[PDB]
From TrEMBL, chains B, D:
Pfam family, one: adh_short_C2
Assigned EC number: 1.1.1.-
Keywords: NADP, Oxidoreductase
Protein name in UniProt: Carbonyl Reductase
Length: 276, 275, 276, 275
């Protein structure tokens, strides 16, 4: 009695919750100064571009790696932008490794304000009907779904401990559409799972954090023939693949105070690919 | 050169593919006379409803169980409707088991025309943050996603061998929305996966089969009072559904009533996903 | 006090509402015997196929026409299936004509149980940037949106008077995706509007009726070159255009007691076109 | 022959098209320094928030009004941020008016780089079945859909002439879900139309412009208590949003921060569309 109780999440407490106090200047909303970001898969590709953009925005950055040493990448951020950066080696497929890596990052930086769950794996084996060995399926799920959940489960405890945070899960247009002509049902499945995990966690963590996805389309960064890429261009309204530098604005948007009412959303950056 | 080649799947051959001959009368399109259906999770709940309606439509039905013997339920189908029916035990979380089960089923009935992948593992443990056993996460992913993929992977080979088939994956409104107030992110995740797996397989199997999902809302089958009251308040029709309100959609997707329907998600939820 | 009040629609009364009593036989759920259906745009194409399938299911059928006489079509249903059928001439763009036509149909058949709002118009003028005359835009909206709303607004009063009904709005994949290579923004806009009108009405009419859409893909029934259709086939997972006879099962599904828990839904029949 | 021709729009020319040069520093991508923005419905509410944030980002801003004089609001922008600004009166429901307004605006500022189509007609009359005046329906469709199309139709010619542009259409969560308990089917219909119009124009304008939507949830701008309480109960964040929580997205879509973003729908709703 005497309380408007949420239908979504009672841990919100009596409603309405209070809006944050923000700068009246839109440009200040995007600064990450005074914040710690942890960006997985940041030894290259999208994760590196996001890690570097967050440093530009003023954030201390924990980069992750596994196959290739990124200590000099983390050192490069320190030297270039005057920000604390350290690199961490971890197999995202191993939940104990994730727990220890996250626990260690909390010690070195003090806290974590922004987390980017950036799971990189692809399915290149064609139609699944001819892949009788479930090791390919199971490897996609372990890295691209379980590995994303391990990171989320651990970072949510830190967000709740601190009463604040912003989790970004890197999904894909493959979470919304079925890629053609390269058939990759297992990858599309894990990415769709990622997208709806982010929305589910958005409800569960709303008293202490925001959760959103970025869904990139075809970004210029393997076994893609010229005639395959040609078909991608033909079906993309802008007519080309994107650049990693065209993703960083969306990742900064979701990481910062520019999006404090944005949760459970999927920011699609795909040159229009999902529209036809 | 000279052919129109699909951008979706070159196994379609030169385009356009050709349409089937269909009955002149709309009611005959829904008949399963002459067909074999295999319905997982069929010892009760939604699965049993579907298996019985398929026999009413005239189908031989393989029912599945895991908990209690369903042989008598299969005998009821055989007795009441005059069709072939048998019960099979399998842990769909184990691929050898489902492979051997589906292999045995096509031996026993000759073929499989209609398959319903129905997973039944639920998440009852509240917000995931306080559940430090990935055992519950792993259990949901293993049965509700991996298990559905094992059935799919195996039934596709049969459909491709025969050049025909209809796969229905039972998903949930949880594949589209986030249930409240009972928080169940792992369940929602697996059901969204199933929904997009179906769409992906629809492209891959298009030369020989259709793949669609049914997404039920809140169905009163075989939850606190205040919880259910909130579900009712948020449901446009104002109530939970009955299993008899699902079988029409399952028969639609199973039969020649839907021969141009593939990769679709048939939502049966009293409007729940609309507000 | 003493009442669970809907958050959706208080006219539902105290919750839960009561489920209908249905046949225990699935095949009986699809019969339309004892019911009156009104199918607009039924002088040919999809509307004719639906009108004939409903007669096969046992329903009395009111067919609509405007440009071509359908009296002999309505007469053909009577002679062939032993069902009451009459044809009505009406310009769906004129709201008074719609009101009078619906009011007249209620008299002749006694009631209306099933209504199919089947608005037929297309945009063939290419990209809108070069159509400076708004008469093309306004004609699409008037027929494909306003005309659908006129029919709905009028049939809802009859459904509410009787406490029962099933409205089906014929939408299109164009309501969900952007057709290519033929550019038709005005048509896609009206069809998207239709799809979300159906969901909106589903909430508002839930005490007395169900509202759903059928969204056909490319169905073989104008100014479509061979190379245009070729591109449609290439992007369609089944690899072909559909037949009108592949739509009637979905229209029967939504019209009958097979779908009494189905409301606010969009049944897509498109050979998979919206999946890539 | 020899070229790769788009399946979306042959006006793209031989594929692939080419990417723009962009600033090395992510913060510079958000600058509107050197650009002209035109924001409809800009005498207050969301529109004014957007117009002021664009000037903060360094943009010349044309503001629109229809009710009260906004010339002073435009003078405030000119005074506080050191940019060009002017207020224009127009009934966006009348195409001659918006055509003449937009023509006058490109004359006064030289060009238009960013356009925000923001319609503000709301439906407050409850369930449509008791509203026998299509005057309210026609009013919503005329302003919230036709009016948005008139602005779009006219600004596209400018973008195409200049080979550059970003159009943001303000839609609503009402374009995706059905608001409860206040029933407003005509508003929901027009907003869904706007959302798909934006996607359609994104394909058509791709050789020279980007088109995206912002879909705000419940924003407390300038409704009974029990009504708002239910909105809060159904919002995952547990509150209404502030206009200052929208301007980040509007600046993202307006600027070179989003040069690969087109046909997208940026939802800012506290999670409302998730359950
Ligand atoms: Mg598509
Ligand atoms: Mg909802």
């Amino acid at each position: 009695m005497g309380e408007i109780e949420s239908y979504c999440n009672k841990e919100l407490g009596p409603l309405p919750t209070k809006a944050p106090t923000l700068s009246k200047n839109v440009l200040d909303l995007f600064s990450l100064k005074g914040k710690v970001a942890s960006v997985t898969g940041s030894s290259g590709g999208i994760g590196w571009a996001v890690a570097e953009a967050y440093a530009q925005a003023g954030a201390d950055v924990a980069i992750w790696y596994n196959s290739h040493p990124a200590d000099e990448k983390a050192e490069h951020l320190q030297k270039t932008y005057g920000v604390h950066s350290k690199a961490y080696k971890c197999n995202i497929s191993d939940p104990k490794s994730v727990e220890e890596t996250i626990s260690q990052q909390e010690k070195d930086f003090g806290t974590i304000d922004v987390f980017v769950a950036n799971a990189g794996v692809t399915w290149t084996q064609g139609p699944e009907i001819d892949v009788d060995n479930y090791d390919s399926w199971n490897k996609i799920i372990s890295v691209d779904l379980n590995g994303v959940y391990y990171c989320s489960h651990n970072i949510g405890k830190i967000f709740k401990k601190n009463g604040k945070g912003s989790l970004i899960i890197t999904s894909s247009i493959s979470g919304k559409i079925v890629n053609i002509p390269q058939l990759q049902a297992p990858y599309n499945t894990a990415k769709a799972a990622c997208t709806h995990l982010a929305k589910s966690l958005a409800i569960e963590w709303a008293p202490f954090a925001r959760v959103n996805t970025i869904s990139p389309g075809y970004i210029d960064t393997d076994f893609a023939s010229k005639d395959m890429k040609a078909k991608w261009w033909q079906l993309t309204p802008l007519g080309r693949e994107g650049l990693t530098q065209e993703l960083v604005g969306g990742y900064l948007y979701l990481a910062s105070n520019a999006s404090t009412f944005t949760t459970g959303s999927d920011v699609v950056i795909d040159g229009g690919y999902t529209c036809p």
